[PDB]
Design a protein around this ligand. Structure first.
Ligand SMILES: *[C@H]1O[C@H](CO)[C@@H](O)[C@H](O)[C@H]1NC(C)=O
Length: 497
């Protein structure tokens, strides 16, 4: 319905400019007949999830790369896609006028947008907060009588999450993760730095920390919000690092194992929130398979663990096969889930680069890689940031797909936004990854999935400068003849029946 209004800021591509009365959006989805495909295209040259259609033919006119769907080769089912309602994101969104806020929320959660169905929610403060605080700062309160939700929750995060669910295309799943406990539960008595919980799994410290998880859930429940899942701690390895700058809580794999087995597992199970899933790790995949081996080979811990949550900071390179692949092999019945990704901390690089095509490609290349190694979901970090990558109480170092400029009541939708949407829009919960076979060595990245209703969705990413002529074969339908232009991403959809 409404096209991107482009704007360059000097980087390789454009942002799309939205404001109180205008934002780019889609029409409702339309279901073309068997023999017709839909293609959505984004390009570094400026196209933004532009729709076209064409035929799937019985004859084959391409002589280059062929990608053959193999619908009978079945892999993981998809949980979903989303991002984090941090203090910083809530603050930025609420800094726009109400009509602009709604266009931002629709861009992410609406069928007029890209269909998010996951929100990660920090349990109290992180670096993307404008202060350090927790839910129970009154010291030596072991029964957590003074546990309460501050304004950040009751005024910023919660009302914005209700509004997102109201707008939402699909059921949305909430995920919670803590950065720090009350410092009076910590070896180091500090919000950050090298410090873990005091004492031993089973003691009053470990039992109070677990009670906190339930207290959190009770409070959101009062606010009529329920969680799909919680993580056992955000990046537990960080809090073992001397002088780590942000809110953390250190756990060795062994400590997490025993904390889950002795404390968090039982406490959750004995509560009215026993249906909430528990995910372990919530940290870099570089810590796999080791971290999985340690926790999941103890039946006492394993009974409480539904999945393994992973992060990747994308400016790096950690091999997927040895980590995700091998972890799947060793524990094929415990789901992998990407719970946090972000980019831009290269000290020589701007935290926000408005219009960076590279950062976009980094998003989609990662999602493809994830999906190719059994990951069932992918969650972005901050939903929105200001143009400096903030607010952040320690230091700005990362980008966000939506950058908010409050002095102009405008927000910019980055290439990252559209690289994400090529997946989130077109891969509903319960879609299953299926085979897609390359006829020859090639420069593309691609992934095929089958919707719950049986239809096909294929994403093709070209991170090269050169156009790649391409045929996609569906055995039940025929040959789809196309070209993957240099620096483009396409999502193809077609009925198979
Ligand atoms: C959004 O608002 C601006 C200035 O307030 C208005 O002139 C403009 O047409 C809108 N955005 C666009 C380019 O549609």
């Amino acid at each position: 319905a409404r096209p991107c209004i482009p704007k360059s800021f000097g980087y390789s591509s454009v942002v799309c400019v939205c404001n109180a009365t205008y934002c780019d959006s889609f029409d409702p989805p339309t279901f073309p007949a068997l023999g017709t495909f839909s293609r959505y295209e984004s390009t570094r040259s400026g196209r933004r999830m532009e729709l076209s259609m064409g035929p799937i033919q019985a004859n084959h006119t391409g002589t280059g790369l062929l990608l053959t769907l193999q619908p009978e080769q079945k892999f993981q089912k998809v949980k979903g896609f989303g991002g984090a309602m941090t203090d910083a994101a809530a603050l930025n969104i609420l800094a726009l006028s109400p009509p602009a806020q709604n266009l931002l929320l629709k861009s992410y959660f609406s069928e007029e947008g890209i269909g998010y169905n996951i929100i990660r929610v920090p349990m109290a403060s992180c670096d993307f907060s404008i202060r350090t605080y927790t839910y129970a700062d009154t010291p030596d309160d072991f029964q957590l009588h003074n546990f309460s939700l501050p304004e950040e929750d009751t005024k910023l995060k919660i009302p914005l999450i209700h509004r997102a669910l109201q707008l939402a295309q699909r059921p949305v799943s909430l995920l919670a993760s803590p950065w720090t406990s009350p410092t009076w539960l910590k070896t180091n008595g500090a919000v950050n730095g090298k410090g873990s919980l005091k004492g031993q799994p089973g003691d009053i410290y470990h039992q109070t920390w677990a009670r906190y998880f339930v207290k959190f859930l009770d409070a959101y429940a009062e606010h009529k919000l329920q969680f799909w899942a919680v993580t056992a701690e955000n990046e537990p390895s960080a809090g073992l690092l001397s002088g780590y700058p942000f809110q953390c809580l250190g756990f060795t794999p062994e400590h997490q194992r025993d904390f889950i087995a002795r404390d968090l597992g039982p406490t959750l199970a004995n509560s009215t929130h026993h249906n909430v899933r528990l995910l372990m790790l919530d940290d870099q995949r570089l810590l796999l398979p080791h971290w999985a081996k340690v926790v999941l080979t103890d039946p006492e811990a394993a009974k409480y663990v539904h999945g393994i949550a992973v992060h990747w900071y994308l400016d790096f390179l950690a091999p997927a096969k040895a980590t995700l692949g091998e972890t799947h092999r060793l524990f094929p019945n415990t789901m992998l889930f990407a719970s946090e990704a972000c980019v831009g901390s290269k000290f020589w690089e701007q935290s926000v680069r408005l219009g960076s095509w590279d950062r976009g490609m980094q998003y989609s290349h990662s999602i493809i890689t994830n999906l190719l190694y059994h990951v069932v979901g992918w969650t972005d970090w901050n939903l929105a940031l200001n143009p400096e990558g903030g607010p952040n109480w320690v230091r700005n170092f990362v980008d966000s797909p939506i950058i908010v400029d409050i002095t102009k009541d405008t927000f910019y939708k980055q290439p990252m936004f559209y690289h994400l949407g090529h997946f989130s829009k077109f891969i509903p919960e319960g879609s299953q990854r299926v085979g897609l076979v390359a006829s020859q060595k090639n420069d593309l990245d691609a992934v095929a999935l089958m919707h719950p209703d049986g239809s096909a969705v294929v994403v093709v990413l070209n991170r090269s400068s050169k156009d790649v002529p391409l045929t996609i074969k569906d055995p039940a339908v025929g040959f789809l003849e196309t070209i993957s232009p240099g620096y483009s991403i396409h999502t193809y959809l077609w009925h198979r029946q």
